[PDB]
Motif scaffolding. Structure first.
Motif, short mmCIF file in Angstrom:
data_model
loop_
_atom_site.label_atom_id
_atom_site.label_comp_id
_atom_site.label_asym_id
_atom_site.label_seq_id
_atom_site.Cartn_x
_atom_site.Cartn_y
_atom_site.Cartn_z
N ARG A 78 0.81 -1.21 0.00
CA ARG A 78 0.00 0.00 0.00
C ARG A 78 0.85 1.27 0.00
N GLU A 79 2.09 1.19 0.46
CA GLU A 79 2.99 2.35 0.46
C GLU A 79 3.89 2.40 -0.76
N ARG A 80 4.30 1.24 -1.29
CA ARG A 80 4.97 1.23 -2.59
C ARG A 80 4.09 1.88 -3.64
N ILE A 81 2.83 1.44 -3.74
CA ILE A 81 1.92 1.97 -4.74
C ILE A 81 1.80 3.48 -4.59
N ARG A 82 1.73 3.97 -3.35
CA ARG A 82 1.65 5.40 -3.11
C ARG A 82 2.90 6.10 -3.61
N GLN A 83 4.07 5.50 -3.38
CA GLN A 83 5.32 6.13 -3.80
C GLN A 83 5.39 6.24 -5.32
N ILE A 84 5.05 5.17 -6.04
CA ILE A 84 5.16 5.25 -7.49
C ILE A 84 4.10 6.20 -8.03
N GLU A 85 2.93 6.24 -7.39
CA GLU A 85 1.92 7.22 -7.80
C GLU A 85 2.45 8.63 -7.63
N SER A 86 3.12 8.90 -6.50
CA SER A 86 3.65 10.23 -6.24
C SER A 86 4.68 10.63 -7.28
N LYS A 87 5.62 9.73 -7.60
CA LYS A 87 6.63 10.09 -8.59
C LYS A 87 6.04 10.16 -9.99
N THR A 88 4.97 9.41 -10.27
CA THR A 88 4.26 9.60 -11.53
C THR A 88 3.65 10.99 -11.61
N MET A 89 3.01 11.44 -10.53
CA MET A 89 2.46 12.79 -10.53
C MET A 89 3.57 13.82 -10.68
N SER A 90 4.73 13.56 -10.07
CA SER A 90 5.86 14.47 -10.23
C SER A 90 6.30 14.56 -11.68
N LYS A 91 6.45 13.41 -12.35
CA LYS A 91 6.89 13.42 -13.74
C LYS A 91 5.85 14.08 -14.65
N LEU A 92 4.59 13.66 -14.54
CA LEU A 92 3.55 14.25 -15.36
C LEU A 92 3.41 15.74 -15.08
N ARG A 93 3.75 16.17 -13.87
CA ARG A 93 3.78 17.59 -13.55
C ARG A 93 4.91 18.32 -14.27
N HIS A 94 5.89 17.58 -14.79
CA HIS A 94 6.95 18.20 -15.57
C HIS A 94 6.34 18.93 -16.77
N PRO A 95 6.84 20.11 -17.14
CA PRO A 95 6.24 20.82 -18.28
C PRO A 95 6.32 20.06 -19.59
N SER A 96 7.20 19.07 -19.70
CA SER A 96 7.31 18.28 -20.92
C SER A 96 5.97 17.63 -21.27
N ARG A 97 5.50 16.72 -20.41
CA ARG A 97 4.25 16.01 -20.65
C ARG A 97 3.07 16.73 -20.00
N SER A 98 2.97 18.04 -20.24
CA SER A 98 1.85 18.83 -19.74
C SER A 98 1.23 19.68 -20.84
N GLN A 99 2.04 20.13 -21.79
CA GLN A 99 1.56 21.08 -22.79
C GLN A 99 0.41 20.49 -23.60
N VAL A 100 0.59 19.26 -24.08
CA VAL A 100 -0.46 18.61 -24.87
C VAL A 100 -1.73 18.45 -24.05
N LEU A 101 -1.61 18.39 -22.73
CA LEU A 101 -2.77 18.28 -21.85
C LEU A 101 -3.23 19.62 -21.30
N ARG A 102 -2.51 20.71 -21.55
CA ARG A 102 -2.91 22.00 -20.99
C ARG A 102 -4.25 22.44 -21.56
N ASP A 103 -4.38 22.46 -22.88
CA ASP A 103 -5.62 22.95 -23.49
C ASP A 103 -6.81 22.07 -23.16
N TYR A 104 -6.59 20.79 -22.84
CA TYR A 104 -7.70 19.91 -22.51
C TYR A 104 -8.29 20.24 -21.14
N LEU A 105 -7.44 20.59 -20.18
CA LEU A 105 -7.88 20.87 -18.81
C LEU A 105 -8.68 19.69 -18.25
#
Length: 105
Positions: A78-105
């Motif tokens: 239950r804590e491993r899953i939380r950790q990988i979820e957190s670092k996934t949110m960190s990566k997706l929060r990177h401006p790289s993989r955000s622009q294509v999703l910005r206009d979608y909101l």
DNA sequence: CAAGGCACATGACAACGGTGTTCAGTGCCGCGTTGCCCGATACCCCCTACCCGTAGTTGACTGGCATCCGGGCGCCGGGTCGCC
């Protein structure tokens, strides 16, 4: 609804009010493009990170799954899953993989 | 003059020198996979202001509500009445 609409002929109050159940094709196709673009960016990341985020947020079924709920099929904690979820949110929060999703909101 | 006797060096003889190796063990000190311990939130409990369904109200109080038009045409089609 079958009132004269104030007109003797050719009119009915029942043919002047627009419904709301009808699917707007514009919104539907925009949602489909959003789904495809999100799935593409999701595939861009690692397949394991992809899968765990997909099962957490329920991108293949309507209902999302809890953290520990993911730690049964995938056999993780239950804590491993939380950790990988957190670092996934960190990566997706990177401006790289955000622009294509910005206009979608 | 030739043969026999003593120096120094010499063909091998291992074992030290010193260094870089074979295993091998165990850590040393960098990266990873799951233990805490909690904290919150979903699921049981009681009653109560109000919503919703049903029961009566003993002077008598006994037939509504109508429609009402300036098409207009034109036909079909059958029903009803007339003819006899």
């Amino acid at each position: 609804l079958h009132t004269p609409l104030g007109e003797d002929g050719d009119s009915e109050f029942g043919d002047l009010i627009e419904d709301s159940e009808a699917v707007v094709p514009a919104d539907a196709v925009s949602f489909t493009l959003l789904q495809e673009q999100l799935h593409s960016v999701l595939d861009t990341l690692s397949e394991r990170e992809a899968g765990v985020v997909s099962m957490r947020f329920g991108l293949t079924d309507g209902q999302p799954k809890t953290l520990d709920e993911i730690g049964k099929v995938y056999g993780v904690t239950r804590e491993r899953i939380r950790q990988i979820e957190s670092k996934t949110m960190s990566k997706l929060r990177h401006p790289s993989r955000s622009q294509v999703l910005r206009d979608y909101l």
